[PDB]
Write a protein that binds this ligand. Structure first.
Ligand SMILES: *[C@@H]1O[C@H](CO)[C@@H](O)[C@H](O)[C@H]1NC(C)=O
Ligand SMILES: [Ca+2]
Ligand SMILES: [Cl-]
Length: 496
């Protein structure tokens, strides 16, 4: 469960949020594979409720109607096509598995689904699975409203409705089998793993019972005995009866404290400073590195819909965002997930964004295709952070330094820090309100290195800053607090 199953050498996955299968297939071949990305997290591929009020929001995909591979992202044929092409190029696919619940109980019955399947929330009828009233936790939940009312009670958090979402009775073998049937169908198709949505709302034991019914990965692409990569979505900050450590026996867990803390540190909130990142990782109360799935922002908290709140950094904060992502990708802690989003009309009122529901770029509900500009950037309102030079080059940096230890740390007691990874990489950050000019020990072999943040190494030459490492491994770095990107990164493969 704990291994990503990525090709040797690729250390990151990217969340291509709301992308169409056909676009992902193309991206795998034209960019993801050549650039060294390990895999892709896809949006839920199963049929969901079609909400029109508000129009088509992104969260309608977390309200299942059936396990049919039929959504705004494409049909089953297109989905299978994407997995095959991506796998054939060495890029894995990770499915977002929404198995804790079905749609909201207040949703009207009918055929308002992405595939026309009929459903009736009121009577607990989902004939396309099929599921009936006997398959939900309505009789098990003890709250007066039937919804989760108090998170201090670990029992209702697992047996009651998350904001009204019909809760599946995961202790019943029938339900466990229907879910395994769905996941095994995907595994046999070729997916390498899953993101278990709302894992906190499920009993660790119920999850285990389901994982026990899962097949090994497709032997046409994976070595015999390969188990699917499992990362459970558990929002565990401090003070809750439920701990993410309770789920270690099933696979990895999302470390939401990672992005929240990095955000406040980079934003320099509450007296925090980058020099405190010296013991970043478990020393900060995070889960063990071999059980952590980390990220700066997620599709949820990038719009204030999740843990982290206001401190979370996103593409909206481009400058600080690139720095945070750079630090994450350079630091050895956990397995990294890169975010890829779309622009939406952010409309703040009394501190909250009233347009946080807006779905992907579309034409009358039809998701727009991802277009590639001449400068490798995207159009149609897709942000494509994974294509930003500073982020893409750090993705490669992580691959190059994979396995190298954390060393040669340096800090000015404020917001100017630096560190290297063995003798394959070195990175320097300047987040102070003054310039940084100093000679540091990089631990790298002598030579001329191209700064991969400001430029690239293109055929024996650098298109940006050049760093010169002397015989004793020392090198001079100059970063003004006015630089577009206040940090420099160089590695073994950026050496001239
Ligand atoms: C690098 O660029 C210079 C011109 O600025 C050129 O003279 C030199 O031959 C180039 N080297 C390579 C290896 O392309
Ligand atoms: Ca539940
Ligand atoms: Cl997540």
């Amino acid at each position: 469960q704990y291994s990503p199953n990525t090709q040797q050498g690729r250390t990151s996955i990217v969340h291509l949020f709301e992308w169409r299968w056909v676009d992902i297939a193309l991206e795998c071949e034209r960019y993801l594979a050549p650039k060294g990305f390990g895999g892709v997290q896809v949006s839920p591929p199963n049929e969901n409720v079609a909400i029109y009020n508000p129009f088509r929001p992104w969260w309608e995909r977390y309200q299942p109607v059936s396990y049919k591979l039929c959504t705004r992202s494409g049909n089953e044929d297109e989905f299978r096509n994407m997995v095959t092409r991506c796998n054939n190029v060495g890029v894995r696919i990770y499915v977002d598995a929404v198995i804790n619940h079905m749609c909201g109980n207040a949703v009207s019955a009918g055929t308002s689904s992405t595939c026309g399947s009929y459903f009736n929330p009121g009577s607990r009828d989902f004939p396309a699975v099929p599921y009936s009233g006997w398959d939900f936790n309505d009789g098990k939940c003890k709250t007066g409203s039937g919804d989760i009312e108090n998170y201090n009670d670990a029992t209702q958090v697992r047996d009651c409705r998350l904001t009204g979402l019909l809760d599946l009775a995961l202790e019943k073998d029938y339900v466990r089998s229907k879910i395994a049937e769905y996941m095994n169908h995907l595994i046999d198709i070729g997916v390498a793993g899953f993101r278990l949505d709302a894992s906190k709302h499920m009993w660790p034991g119920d999850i285990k019972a389901i994982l026990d019914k899962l097949h090994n990965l497709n032997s046409n692409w994976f070595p015999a005995g390969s188990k699917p990569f499992i990362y459970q979505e558990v929002i565990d900050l401090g003070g809750e009866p439920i701990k993410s450590s309770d789920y270690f026996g099933n696979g990895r867990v999302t470390e939401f404290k990672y992005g929240a803390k990095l955000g406040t540190v980079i934003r320099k909130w509450n007296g925090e400073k980058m020099s405190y990142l010296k013991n970043w990782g478990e020393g900060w109360g995070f889960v063990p590195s071999d059980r952590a799935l980390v990220f700066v922002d997620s599709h949820d908290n990038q719009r204030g819909h999740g843990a982290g709140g206001a401190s979370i950094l996103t593409f909206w904060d481009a400058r600080l965002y690139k720095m945070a992502v750079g630090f994450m990708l350079a630091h050895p802690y956990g397995f990294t997930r890169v975010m890829s989003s779309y622009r939406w009309p952010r409309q703040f009122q009394n501190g909250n964004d009233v347009n946080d529901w807006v779905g992907p770029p579309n034409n009358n509900g039809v998701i727009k295709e991802v277009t590639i500009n001449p400068d490798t950037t995207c159009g149609n309102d897709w942000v494509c952070e994974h294509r930003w030079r500073q982020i893409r080059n750090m993705v490669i940096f992580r691959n190059v330094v994979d396995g190298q230890p954390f060393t040669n740390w340096y800090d000015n007691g404020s917001n100017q820090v630096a560190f290297g990874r063995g003798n394959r990489g070195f990175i320097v950050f300047n987040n102070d309100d003054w310039s940084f000019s100093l000679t540091l020990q990089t631990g790298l072999p002598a030579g001329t290195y191209c700064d991969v943040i400001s430029g690239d190494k293109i055929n024996g030459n650098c298109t940006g800053i050049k760093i010169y490492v002397s015989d004793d491994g020392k090198a001079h770095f100059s970063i003004s607090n006015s630089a577009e990107d206040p940090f420099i990164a160089i590695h073994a493969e950026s050496k001239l």
